[PDB]
Amino acid sequence: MVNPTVFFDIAVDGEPLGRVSFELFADKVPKTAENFRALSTGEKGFGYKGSCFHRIIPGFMCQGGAFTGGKSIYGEKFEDENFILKHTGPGILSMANAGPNTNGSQFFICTAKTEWLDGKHVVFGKVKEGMNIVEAMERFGSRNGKTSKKITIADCGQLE
Ligand SMILES: CCOC(=O)CNC(=O)NCc1ccc(N)cc1
């Protein structure tokens, strides 16, 4: 089977910035890819639509996925599936966590190589189209992650 592709339409204080799409590496991390895919379509009855990027650190990453801390599709938190894929550069999609085996819905998009996270955060996808949109988002962050405008996922879903 072809790896899934999903998309986010990004808005800044309600004004459209464009569409970002992601390849999900289901061939290496099937359970982790399936969680993000289903949260993007809304098929379990909840997910990423309407949520914000709450933590943005320029030169590092954009983090989102906490909706009313977030939750996985497998009921609160699931195990680290593997560490096959590494944090190799801009556009890498990886799971946020609060220690071992604490994956939920929160995720981050890298804007640099973040090798110090290897073996602790599960990498599961990469930006395919719209990397410049992620770079534009990054400009609304700060040292501590606070955003100066409301950066939201206005819409989301599956393309393949
Ligand atoms: C670049 C990645 O940096 C972090 O992951 C920092 N930790 C973090 O935000 N922890 C909060 C959190 C709570 C519950 C779940 N499920 C996931 C995350």
Numbering used by the authors: 1 to 68, 74 to 165
What sentences appear in the manuscript?
We test the novel aMD/MSM protocol by both characterising and rationally modifying the free energy surface of human cyclophilin A (CypA). This enzyme is a human prolyl isomerase whose incorporation into new virus assemblies is essential for HIV-1 infectivity and HCV replication, making it a major drug target.
To manipulate the energy surface, we implemented a design strategy based on hydrogen bonding patterns to stabilise specifically sparsely populated conformers with millisecond lifetimes ([Fig fig2]). Whereas WT has the 70s loop predominantly in the closed state, consistent with the majority of X-ray structures of CypA solved to date, D66A was predicted to predominantly occupy the open state of the 70s loop. Overall with respect to CypA the population of states in which the 70s-loop is closed/open transitioned from ca. 70:30% to 25:75%. Initially, we examined binding of an inhibitor against both WT and D66A. The *K*_d_ for D66A was 12-fold weaker than for WT ([Fig fig4]), indicating a substantial change in the underlying protein conformations. Using a combination of R_1ρ_ and CPMG NMR experiments, with X-ray crystallography we tested these predictions ([Fig fig4],[Fig fig5]) and verified that exactly as predicted, the 70s loop is substantially disordered and open in D66A, and adopts a conformation very similar to the minor conformations populated in WT ensemble. This correlation strongly supports the *in silico* design strategy demonstrating that the ground state of D66A is similar to the ‘excited’ minor conformational state adopted by the WT, and that the design process effectively swapped the major and minor conformers. Overall the key finding is that the NMR data shows that the ‘ground’ conformational state of D66A has the 70s loop in an ‘open’ conformation, which from the chemical shifts, is similar to the ‘excited’ state adopted by the WT protein.
